[PDB]
Amino acid sequence: MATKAVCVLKGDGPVQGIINFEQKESNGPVKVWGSIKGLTEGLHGFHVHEFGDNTAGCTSAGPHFNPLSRKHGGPKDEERHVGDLGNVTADKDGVADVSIEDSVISLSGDHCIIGRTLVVHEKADDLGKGGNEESTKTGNAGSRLACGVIGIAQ
Amino acid sequence: MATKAVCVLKGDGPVQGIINFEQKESNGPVKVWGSIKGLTEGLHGFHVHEFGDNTAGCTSAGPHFNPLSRKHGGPKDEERHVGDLGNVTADKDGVADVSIEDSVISLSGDHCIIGRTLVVHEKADDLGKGGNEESTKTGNAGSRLACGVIGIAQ
Ligand SMILES: CCCC[C@H](C)/C=C(C)/C=C/C(=O)O
Ligand SMILES: [Zn+2]
Ligand SMILES: [Zn+2]
């Protein structure tokens, strides 16, 4: 019944932010928006990972949320992880003003992302086009800069 | 659905801990265990609040999770909030070795607490027996010392 969710991103370094999720219809897309600061200018992978487990920091969130056991892709690919939201772009001040609409993640059902972990990564997601085994798993997006558990919101 | 959940508790002060949840059968009880350190010796209210919203620290989690619109009570009362897990006891070293079993919360379905916020409070929960308005809402457990969003665990 959740139509709204929210996530506070934190990590070891300066990266932090707040990301909102809104889904007016359970059969409709999820709007994803907010601000992340402290990033290097440019593209950063932006993924929902499987577990809402931050006991060992972002490492314990596990791999990309992939209940259909597909290969990694970009959000517009048919072959993609449910958690594959592509990249977000930080401006010259280090601020990513996130604005994504996605119809594969959901706030309910099998693809529900509530209770899982949103992660913003060190470098660009290659969207599965990197030609190596890592590309088909993580997009070569590198280390986890900040994360948080996605929670139900008012 | 989920059989395991986990929660990392943090706050403005020194209180921190890790709480695990286990529900081997979807229609059976939830086991809740772990360790919270940095507490004053004695009883501390221990509740699931409605929203997994940490944007204002523990404040934005809202009231106790109460989908059945009941009055506050202790875990063994029939008249209780779903989020009413009672008290946890911190020893002389400031450590609460939590061990709770509850049949009202769940890790799936309508009483699902995944994506909501676990909070440990400053004072004892009076279990609804304090004789004022506050008693039947929060148990007079006082301020929110630490909290975290409850996430799906491996
Ligand atoms: C190992 C460094 C590769 C970085 C390359 C110059 C750009 C990439 C991968 C971005 C791709 C994209 O736009 O998705
Ligand atoms: Zn992926
Ligand atoms: Zn209550």
Author numbering:
A (entry chain B), B (entry chain A): 0 to 153
Manuscript excerpt for this entry:
Single residue mutations in the antioxidant enzyme superoxide dismutase 1 (SOD1) are reported in familial ALS (fALS) patients throughout the world. The native structure of SOD1 is a homodimer of 32kDa size. The intramolecular disulfide bond and Cu-Zn metal coordination impart higher structural stability and keep the dimer intact. The SOD1 mutants in ALS have a toxic-gain of function by destabilizing the functional SOD1 homodimer, consequently inducing fibril-like aggregation with a cytotoxic non-native trimer intermediate.
